[PDB]
Amino acid sequence: SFFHGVTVTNVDIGARTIALPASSVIGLCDVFTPGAQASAKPNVPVLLTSKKDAAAAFGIGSSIYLACEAIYNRAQAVIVAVGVETAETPEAQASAVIGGISAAGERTGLQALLDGKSRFNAQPRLLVAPGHSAQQAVATAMDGLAEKLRAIAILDGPNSTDEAAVAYAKNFGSKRLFMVDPGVQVWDSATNAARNAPASAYAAGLFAWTDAEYGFWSSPSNKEIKGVTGTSRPVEFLDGDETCRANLLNNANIATIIRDDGYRLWGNRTLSSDSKWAFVTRVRTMDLVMDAILAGHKWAVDRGITKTYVKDVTEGLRAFMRDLKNQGAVINFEVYADPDLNSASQLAQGKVYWNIRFTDVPPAENPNFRVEVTDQWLTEVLDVA
Template sequence: MAFFHGIEITEVSDGIRPVETVRSAVIGVVGTAPGASAASFPLDTPVLLPGHPRLAADLGTTGTLPDAVEGIFSQAGAFVVVIRVAEGADTAATLANIIGSEVAGTGIHALPLAGSVTGVVPRILIAPGFTSARAGGTANPAAAALQGVAAKLRAVAVIDAPNTTDAAAITYAGDWGSARLFVVDPHVLVFDQATATNVPRPASPRVAGLMARVDGENGFWYSPSNHIINGIVGTDRPIEFNLSNPNNAANLLNEKRVAVIVRREGWRLWGNRTTSADAQWSFLPVRRTADMVYESLEAAMLWAMARPFSRQLLLDVQETVQTYINTLVTRGALLGGKVWIDPSLNSGVELMAGKLTVDLDLEPPAPLESLKIRAHRNNGYYQELVADMAA
């Protein structure tokens, strides 16, 4: 370098980066609100309600969205992305609007645009009032659309079963085999101020709000099962429930991958499982925890892209991921996790092509679902009793 008599400071950008966990409790809801303000809630456009129900006043009082938003906020002050669609001339036309077009980005297919439009990505998806029907004995098309969008967003969709019988709920759940779908039955009863009566409403908004509340109070690695649902006065049909006897309706429905709402010291969500047939991903919080880890790491590693390969770069990438995993283990979100760079997957040819493969193992904690307590008789305590008297 040229002669320099003085002090030079150069910033070096080596070193690990902090990883921030992405928002897990953003809810995306698709529905109708014919009385809404078109300026505040334009059709097929993601609109963010950042944590307060008063912002939903412009939705009006008709359609499915007002109750859905009220149901969500009765559980928690969540971030809610609202997609309003037009009511059709009949039920079929409205359902078509709810599903929307992937090409045009309308209806349910407007949800992937939320990140660009609102700055947040919905992780819990619902379309209350439109996922229950099985027309002609076929799977529900709105639920099918939610399943596809949930896979794109690394989200889960809470879908309502038919709200008729246990058998119908089991048949409904059998239409699906995805870790992205969480089936809930029956509908809940809420007090309607307009009619001064208890009316049935889809459970999905309350369950989505409950998931957001549990995320905030406990963490995304906690199951929403066995938590009280606020603001409901009952269910549209009773679900038989017994903690100590497996021969009851709630247990059968859970076995068939239907979460239910039961009365036990309040009205509780009861059920941990998605519709996945893969045992590795059947638990809802396990699926969501893995999703949050992946999303957070993707967002955090942007800094590394386009940097020249060096030993320091490899160390920084590996240690950044490992430090985040260690943090999650400390918080209880993971049981363990390890990061490594496998030489066999990172040949000179691969590195010359600008490709780096980093391996990661991790294990989200499964929720306790079956607790067995073994009780034993011990007559030796009688001898202790007599010995105590003689002492």
């Protein structure tokens, strides 16, 4: 039926937690239970936009929603979440997370995140499997998944001692990973107890927030985590301290939390061995201008090569690249077609090469305040005169 008029209803809601709308699509994969409330098929990705579609497709107590309420309480992002079935043993539960093409034709597990493109216009710029990334076989496959998508996979160490996660991060030098070691504890609506959340979705929601108004080129380290209390292993940052838990982890290229109750993240550097791709800003600007170069040059990916086809797009690649220098994404650049690799034999088969050379804003990791108390200003002040 229907009602005419106005209808006041006593409901049970709470915590309007509005944040600015983000744009960087993330991926997601964790476990849930396919009941009659979770009206979603397991191994296919659903497009999420707010808390409600995390609640209608997955259960409230399911581990997807616990990872989806970790991001939407920081930035209203676009989730591409493919759940998996809760298996029994962790050797076979991780078998569901990677998945593969082990069905008849379709994909399953983390490999279903490639279907975010061509279903949703949502290619995941972040990868996060909360909880199921302390296993070695997932984080190896999350890195191979992030290399294909040209994204940043968010990992987490074990929740054990400080000398255990350092030995875990020595498995990778693969320059697309990002590891957040201490387990974020959240309150979760009058449970009167703090649950150890895996703290990979909280930092993944932080990259969506800092993508919006600080831009992709901003170092996503110092910024706040919301919806968080005192973490699992309390990592401090004492200054002038060689063996403090933050700095002992940053040399192993691991993000932490530092301030009270996990106020803020601590990650400037990715899980790389080479010095050039150390930061998470050089690997993020390299991979988020080179789709913004493409989004804006999708017209030139197939066209009859005329006399001006080389010249107009190398004046079109420059004219997009000055807007990044306008808003301060890069420093001065140069864009030019190859004089050496653009031959007519290459032009018969379509191939024609361009060069782009930019440089990124370096983040302000480690300022230095060198300070001496002097007896200098004691003479002219404090006198009779």
